[model samples]
Target chain A: KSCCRSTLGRNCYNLCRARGAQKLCAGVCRCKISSGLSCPKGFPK
Target chain B: KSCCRSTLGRNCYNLCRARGAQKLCAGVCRCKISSGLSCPKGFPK
Candidate 1:
């Protein structure tokens, strides 16, 4: 089934990279972190 | 300029999330990991 899971924590990092993120810090990636972009920059706390 | 980057390890998770990933394990996310998807499942080793 197509599960609409919450993209947070490390998930956010990987997703950002796949979408073409050029940078990464810890489990986070450098991208335009926005809610519409699926959770703001620092998430999964 | 839009740069084509390589996603690995934690970066993969964030990238996947940005691209709409759901689950995250360690620094990896639950998504279809393929070369076209940037990197494969379980990378940065």
Candidate 2:
């Protein structure tokens, strides 16, 4: 599965939303365990 | 009269050294007011 972590403040939330990522926490978003976005893309989750 | 400020940690010192800038302080470098550099060049001084 894949996970996404946001570290760019509120900008992360909006980016996650745009990419259809599932919310893992207030500042954490995730996708499937097998797939994940990359940094500059955002933080690693 | 022109000055230079370095905000990129120690990298600023190295940058200034490479660019032939005269150090005015630990993290500050300067040149003639009319001959100062700009940022991305570094902070304005």
Candidate 3:
């Protein structure tokens, strides 16, 4: 249970950092969207 | 220091969950790779 959640959280940070939206994604990751962590403020996939 | 790390951790969880790759990203998050979290085991970004 906790493991899965922890995994996604890390990926979220990585994605944000890769896209250069780390700042925005910083807050968005909390949602854990179904479509790969959605964040309107985040960079486009 | 810890906040950012924690944020990244959560991000990892969300990304994995959203991408349906939660299982793979589950353990990769521990790294907190600056360029984003690196997961050779994870689905390609």
Candidate 4:
């Protein structure tokens, strides 16, 4: 299971997982869960 | 089993593989192979 998979989707789930790099954001809802993303948008599903 | 893993590395290898998304570039060297990144820099070793 992923941190934001339910809220966003598999794309954002992997994006959130990539938080280890701290360069990209997971998504809008998952933004709070991490700090890499600034204004994430265009969620797949 | 990546495209640019030799020239760039694992990180960039994945980045290049992400060319399917067409939103992110692999790295400096691989940038020419794709069109996501505008001015790719700071590539990891």
Across all models, the iRMS values in order are: 5.2, 18.8, 4.2, 8.8
Task: Estimate TM-scores for all models.
Answer: 0.20, 0.18, 0.25, 0.20
Give DockQ for candidates 1 onward, in order.
Answer: 0.09, 0.01, 0.12, 0.03
Error of 2 at B30 (Å): 64
User: What does candidate 3's lDDT look like per residue over A1-45, in tens digits?
Assistant: 111135476676556655444445656664233444443343332
Please write out the lDDT profile of model 2 over residues A4-34, one tens digit for every residue: 4533544554455533333342335333233
Q: Evaluate all candidate structures by whole-model CA lDDT and list the values in order.
A: 0.39, 0.40, 0.45, 0.39
**Strongest candidate by lDDT:** 3
On the 0 to 100 scale, the lDDT of residue B13 in model 1 is 53
- Give the CAPRI rating of model 3: incorrect
lDDT of 1 by residue, B1-45 (tens): 111233443455555555443434332432343435354323433
Q: What digit string (tens of lDDT, one per residue) describes model 1 on residues A1-45?
A: 111224454465556556643444332432333322355433433
Off by over 4 Å in 3: A1-5, A31-45, B1-45
Question: What value of lDDT does candidate 2 attain over all alpha carbons?
Answer: 0.40
Ranking by DockQ: 3, 1, 4, 2
Question: B1-45, model 3: which lDDT tens digit per residue?
Answer: 111235566676666667646445556664233333333333332
Candidate 2, residue A15: Cα displacement in angstroms equals 0.8
Task: Per model, state how many residue pairs clash.
Answer: 18, 10, 19, 1
